[model samples]
Target chain A: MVLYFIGLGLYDERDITVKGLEIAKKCDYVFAEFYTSLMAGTTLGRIQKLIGKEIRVLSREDVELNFENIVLPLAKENDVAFLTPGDPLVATTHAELRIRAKRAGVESYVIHAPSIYSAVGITGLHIYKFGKSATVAYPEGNWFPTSYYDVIKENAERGLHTLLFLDIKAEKRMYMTANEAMELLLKVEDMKKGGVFTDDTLVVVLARAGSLNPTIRAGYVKDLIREDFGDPPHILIVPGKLMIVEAEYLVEIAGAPREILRVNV
Target chain B: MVLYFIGLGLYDERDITVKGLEIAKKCDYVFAEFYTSLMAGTTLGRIQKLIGKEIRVLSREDVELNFENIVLPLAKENDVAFLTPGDPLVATTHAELRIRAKRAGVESYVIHAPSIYSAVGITGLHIYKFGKSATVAYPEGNWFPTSYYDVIKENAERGLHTLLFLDIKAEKRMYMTANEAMELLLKVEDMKKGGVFTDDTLVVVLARAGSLNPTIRAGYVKDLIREDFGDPPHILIVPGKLMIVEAEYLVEIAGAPREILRVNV
Candidate 1:
């Protein structure tokens, strides 16, 4: 008996790789964990129908609470696949499972798929310049977490690109919009008295990435706050000091104004 | 006549969204930039043949210098399509081209596709935990850039994850391997005299992301430096403080020894 950890890639049901789809179809039991991130245009039902398989959805608690009951036993019997969106092993939990399976005398194989990191090539953000990525959590009381600000500030100080993931409670369908995220950052800036981000700091907002109508907008936080970017699963990029080519490209491609960027010689 | 910047997504030729593929097939002039990144297990020639279109390959220099001679005129008179490896606008250059086209009175549209960042879901690294991303450059004259260390340190101080892009000079077929990248970091640590990272710091290495045989390994840097990861286009993740769930998941899934992770209560 063997276990296959499969990554479904990004976007809709069709985005699953040929190899991944084949494994999903052939596996005796297939389970998926979507809490980490949701597929842009895919639903569990849609994926099930597309693959002609019955996929059991695993909640955060399910995997955390009962890995032995659900995953281990299945692997002990037949070929089982624990599916993830994108490359499966990027998450440490998946790696742990492989190790556990090995310890349990079960063989494991990993199948990979596309992920958001690949998007940097399209953004032309110099994949090399990206720093740490932080999330914008939902406000607790009036005090939104300002920890992410420090991270972004540090990255900017060193001229690295910051990719910010907004908060999303998938089951509730509540997502922090890009505008809301920027506004939160502005508030944090005011409170921290950190000039890290101003009304004029160049910001890039990506809405509904991987969807057919994904929106990419670049401007100051104030300017972008007024615009309505339709859909969930948005990302914000706060670019650090820009290289000449990067600055030129951002302005030309993402509608970023020239004045916002401080080009490096 | 309009110019559409389309993302081909990751994986094989068929991974392109139907809309993007359709637009490319019918465009009067189709140009693709492969210098920034490569499609997983795919080649420009293969994609061109699949789509039944002759694609003009654009080098970095061509896109940077010959924009007017090559792209502008065609974009002005015909529905020209510029194909990127992932979502077109993800790259700052494509964004700049859009702005440039608008300025030239040439209409433009962006067709989004899946990118590597989307893999955050699969990796189980809190999408929000990442600060910015940095590329590992090949050291010149015994000087390894300490830029990435600064980014990581900043992110760590703020409890953020650092997404490290292993450098790839695709034109020259030179990719900074994960092992080499870690070795560089060790050198940076020595220079900074900062305990930012040690041989025992937890690191995650992903190889051949968005491909069938993708490899992911998590361990202390000291252990990772000795392990050989196959192929190109690898990503390194240095996590900050992990949530209990994240720590457990990494252990259960990514094969990290529980002792190596610093979990927050």
Candidate 2:
């Protein structure tokens, strides 16, 4: 009896890798964790129907708090499979889990699939040149957190692109829209007064990645804030610098305004 | 005619989204850039044959240097589809190109697809908890660059996970192994002497994402460096903090030594 942690790639039900699907079908018990991130257009019911397996859905608390008594014992005795959206090993938490399972002498396997990291190459940005990625959390009170801002500033200082993921909780039906995220950045800019995010910052917003109608828009952060990017699972990118080819591709493909870009800079 | 930039996700020919394939089939000229990154277990010829279209491959120099004369004119007059391996918007260079196209009055659209960013969720690490991501480049001389080190340090300071993408040039047949990347980080630790990455820094190595035979290993930096991870296209993750569930899951899944992990401290 082995435990398998599988990553179901983004998009509809069929996006699961052949190996992942095979493992799900054969596993004695299948469980899925959806609180970390949600599949673009997929629902828990839809996944169960497509996989033809009744998945025991685990919440943030279930996996985080009650894992010892609930999950480990079952995983130890049977061919249990834990499923997550995207590549399974991308998260530190999952890796931590794998380590614990090994210590307990549980034989485990990981099945990987497509993730948002692989999607960055689609933006025409140099993958190697990107620095750390930061996420914009939903603002509380009148203050926007500077943690994400600080990371972005650090990346920009080093001339590295920053990938900013907008916060989303599908179960709660809470998603931070790209425009709202930009607005938070605007507020951060006012707080920091360090010129981190400006009206001229080259920002690219992606809406509904992995879906048929995914939208990519490139422009100033101020302008992007005004633009309504339809749908959830949005990503906002701030480029540190642009190579000539990247600049050209953005103009031709993303509709970014030329006056805002620095080709020779 | 609108120019479309489409991302073909990682893996083989079938990884491309239906929308991307549809746009590629209809475009008068289809150009693909591969220098920044390459597809795993797949080739350009195979992709061309599968799509039933002649894709004009663009060199790093061609896309960077000859964009105005060769790529833009066609995009201006006809529907030109620029194909990339992964999400097109992740790269800033692509954003620059879109900005250029808009300047030339070329209407453009972006067709997004699966990427590595979404893969982090598979690890059950809160996607929102990840800070900026950094790439581990090949070591130059006897020194490994600390740029990535600084990025990770900042993320750790902010209690955010740092995802490290192992460098690889598939076309050039050069892939940095996970063990080698860990050794590089060890070097960074030696030089910085800031206690940023000790012998016990929690590290997770994922190899061959988006493939059937994916390998995931979790452990301390020193122990991970001693272990061999087979294949290429690996990602190394350094977690800032681990909740109880993440710690247990890593133990259960990745064979992480529970004794080494410090959940609270």
Candidate 3:
């Protein structure tokens, strides 16, 4: 008679909140979709073993197209859990599913977990300074997306930080690396010539967030575009103006160039 | 020889991640400060029992002024965990403490958890649409702050949502309710005449996020300004332009007025 929308948090099975994990343990059926964001640190088997459940993985089509048909039917009689990466409904379109559940006479509750949207704070940028976010997408045939470039421009003009979510293809197991995202941005810059992203532009890369020793780096695009950040599941940040404290933390903790303390601030 | 900054996720003790809880259990000393944000859903004794450790509570002055003296000294010889509400380094000034640890020759790592900064996703608004955030400070004897009003104006001008963190005097146990925040915004509107936040403007209230039954309400200020949102620690959102999907979720899940689906969108 009830449905649970739980978040798997970031990185690993252990990242799930004790509340979410305990509720998931008692759920009669558990369904999860990972196309939105990937948990780079843990495997599905570990998550299932931790929660002690037989998990059913849903594709984007199954969830976005047939959620009410497949998941709501079970929720009519059982305690069903629909899990996703990060905090549910933040960056994803799953909020509409709650409306579907409401229409189906099913009660729904949201269980939040750590989201990279907020975890980017680990980069030492004040979370409040972040403005409207954009995604760096893979250009397909005849579709070279460059609106993300303008988003960076608009946020920069206002002296605000821009958080860029790199693209991901779950079915193909292709995760966009921060290096690739920067390369795409540079290409966009060539076309738009907006001066949004350049070799001298400062950018921050956070890779494998929520894991111990996750990589945090800050430098100009020319210097860091080829730097190995260890793995996929990367997020890029383009800061506008920096407060002295923000610059200092980046220099000390993120190992950013000491010049940033003077040049960027 | 190490320091860990762990977040006790929103609302309650169980909201802490399994990773955080497991690591906290093994720490030699545990310290926490609640002045940044309050956890209304749990008590100190409950949290101490859950971790099986006596938590030495720190005041804001203690953490901001003497963290190196009171907490870092213990980390020199033993594993120390500094627990804070929400994700550390997001909205708080604690990120600078990581620099302090580096100066003291102590290694520090952050354990991520759920944050209201991201938990606002439950309000059914797109998280990326949120712009630069501001805190609504309570007016003192001579100082009256209205910068949060300008933030709403700036974000709205850019078609971005504004997340307003309400004021809190944790030591006095005084939390500014959403109603109070609304009142302050109205006062600011009367002073500035910016037409940013008016009785007719649409706003969203998220109270006690991460709790099972959090208060999520959306409506015109005229209708909701006096409406009880349950308790303190409320955050207000002055939305800019709303997408149809966002308006629909606000109507269906958040109990927003049906008219917003047409008017606001």
Candidate 4:
């Protein structure tokens, strides 16, 4: 009769909210999709042990193509839980799944969790200064996307930072690094010739967010493109001119160059 | 020898992440400030009971004026935690607290929580579709701030949705309602003569978002103003153009008018 969409947050099974865990334990069946973003610190066996339920993991095609047919039918007569990474709807398309449940005469409620959208605060950048966000996708054969670069251009013109989500191929175990995203932005710059991205551009890289000692680095793209960020699930940020406090943070906390205090400040 | 800044989710004690709760319980001293935003469904007593710690509450003046003097001194010698509503740094000058910690020779870490930044995803608007966010401040006797109106105008011009954070006076126990926010926007529209906001504008209101039966309503501002949203901590959203899936979710889940499927889609 009811479907619960719960978020298992950024890093591990323990990152799930207390509300999310309590609701998931009460449900009769639990379904989750790892294609959106997976817990980099834990395994399916560990998540099952934590939630105290047998979990059925679905693929991207399973969720995006046939969520209603595969999940809602069971939800009609049972208390079913569908888990996703981050907040239930922040990642994407799964929101329409609520509509699908309504069409199938099932009620759905979302249990929110800590997402990278808020986790980016750890970079010591003011969250309100962030403008429109975009995702960097891996360019397929003859199919390249460059809108992410355009987003940075527009936000920078308005003096706002841009949050760039690095692409992930969950099934292939391929996660795009901050270095790859910068490399892609450089390639797009070559085509657009917009001077939006260059070797001198300032960037911030966050790796393994939601953990205690997540890697945070701030520097020019030239020096950072080859820096070791130490893990998967990297996010890149290109900030506009920084405020005095923001500049101090990048310098003191992120180990940014002293010159950024002069330039970004 | 560290200070941890943790967010206590959106509405209640139970909304905190497992990681946050476990860490808070072990802290030598826990301090929290409710002046920024407060939990609607839970109180300081309830949160203290859950965390099994005696929490020291701070006023806005305590946090903004003497955070380093009051909080960082304890963190320099012992494990300490500073708590806030929502994510540790969403708006306001809280992000600068990290800079203060650095100056005090205290290391700080953020324990992420479910913030309204991502919890707004419950409204079924695509999170990525949101542009820069702004707050609706109560106009003072001689000083009225109208930047929020301009924020909505700019985001609307780019076909990006705007997340408007309603103002709060925590110590006075004053929380701004969505209706008051609409009235302010209408007043701004009258003065700016931009027609950015009016009675006919479509809006979405989310009240007590982390609660199980949180109110979510979408319609013209005229109708929404008269609608009873149950309780406080309401958020207002001015959506730009919508995709078919987005419109369908709003209509089916948020009780938006059916006409939106045609006009917004």
- Top DockQ hit: 3
The total of clashing pairs for model 4 equals 0
Candidate 2 per-residue lDDT, tens place, A186-252, comes to 8889888989898778888766655646676888876777888887777788888777776666666
Superposing every Cα of model 4 onto the true structure, what RMSD results? 1.3
Candidate 4, residues A110-144, lDDT tens digits: the string is 99998998888888788877888999999999999
The lDDT for every candidate, in the order shown, is: 0.72, 0.72, 0.92, 0.89
Error of 4 at A126 (Å): 1.6
- Candidate 4 per-residue C-alpha lDDT over B156-186 given as tens digits, one digit per residue, 9 for 90 to 100: 8888899999998888989999999999999
Q: In model 4, what are the clashing residue pairs, if there are any?
A: none
Worst window of 10 by summed lDDT in candidate 3 chain A: A88-97
Choose 3 or 4, whichever is better by DockQ. 3
Fnat for model 1? 0.40
Per-residue lDDT tens digits of candidate 1, residues B71-101? 8788878889888775565433555666567
lDDT value for model 4:
0.89
**Per-residue error at A250 for model 3, in Å?**
0.3
Tens-place lDDT digits, model 3, residues B42-61: 99999999999999999999
lDDT of 2 at A170: 59
lDDT of 2 by residue, B49-86 (tens): 86778999887778777776678889867888888866
With candidate 3 superimposed using the best TM-score fit, by how many Å does residue B239's alpha carbon deviate from the native?
A: 0.7
Worst 10 residues of 2 chain B by lDDT: B113-122
